[PDB]
Amino acid sequence: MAKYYTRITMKRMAQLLDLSVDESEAFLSNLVVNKTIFAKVDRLAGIINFQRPKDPNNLLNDWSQKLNSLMSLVNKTTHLIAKEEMIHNLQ
Amino acid sequence: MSEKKQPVDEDNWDDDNVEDDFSNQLRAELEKHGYKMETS
């Protein structure tokens, strides 16, 4: 169920879970007995917010994006010289 | 360096602020407040 979706409907998730909506709370109690985690669902809006469970500081999100975006840029530059050399090969 | 110039122009405190808040009030003395609830 996890996934990267955000506003998928909880009633639809109950239908995807193949259990009755009326008894869904008991059926989702089975999820609680599984104790897989609490990815987060807003029943008040009838939507399963299955994107992130318990939000920590997003320190890694900037760090990983910064490390990758920079690393891709050197990788682009390192490959760039070879291609520039190839045009110079015919020039 | 005394300024001067402007002469021409708990034990007895701390609770003074609290006392001032209900000095006008507390006519009920709390017991009347209970009686008012009883009438309510």
Partner: protein, 194 residues
């Protein structure tokens, strides 16, 4: 300071100043609850071995002491009124009779409010005296004093909650100590700087 120094309930002997050990206990319960936090109140007075026999003699003292811990708001408000008459009549307790009653009312209002972020004034009336207006007027005056740490609402008739010290008032707590702390250095530097 008295509630801390009345810790000698075990050995008051039969001091002449005390009319009886029973009077010393009535003062110690009255004084401690105003200045004692709920963890101390259960540990020292609610679970107090010596105090329990003495409150066995006095039904009113027992109900008043027990009601705040039991969260019996309706009984304690009536009991507090009985205490007010005794406090005014008593010598050495009459000067602060007003402070004791209002401070207790502020402590009572803080206790039920701490549990619920949203409280209908009708619910507060059920817990305490029936009239909604009388709880509302005390709520507004206490809120104005900075006591009751909450924001009242009208028409919706729901009382909300105020920010925690750890959550964001930590910044305020650093600034409040800082303003006096910084102010001192500004005056001090000038004296040597000349």
């Amino acid at each position: 300071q008295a509630a801390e120094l009345f810790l000698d309930t075990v050995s008051t002997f039969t001091s002449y100043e005390l009319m009886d050990y029973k009077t010393f206990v009535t003062y110690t319960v009255y004084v401690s609850m105003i200045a004692l936090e709920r963890p101390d109140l259960r540990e020292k007075v609610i679970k107090g071995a010596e105090i329990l026999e003495v409150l066995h003699s006095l039904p009113a003292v027992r109900q008043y002491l027990f009601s705040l811990y039991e969260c019996r708001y309706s009984v304690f408000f009536q009991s507090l009124a009985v205490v007010e008459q005794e406090m005014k009549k008593d010598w050495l307790f009459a000067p602060h009779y007003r402070y004791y009653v209002r401070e207790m009312r502020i402590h009572a209002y803080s206790q039920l409010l701490e549990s619920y972020r949203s409280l209908t004034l009708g619910y507060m009336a059920e817990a305490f005296g029936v009239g909604v207006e009388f709880i509302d007027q005390e709520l507004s005056r206490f809120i104005a004093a900075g006591r009751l740490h909450c924001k009242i609402d009208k028409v919706n008739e729901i009382v909300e909650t105020n920010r925690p010290d750890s959550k964001n008032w930590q910044y305020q707590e650093t600034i409040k100590k800082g303003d006096l702390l910084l102010n001192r250095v500004q005056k001090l530097s000038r004296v040597i700087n000349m």
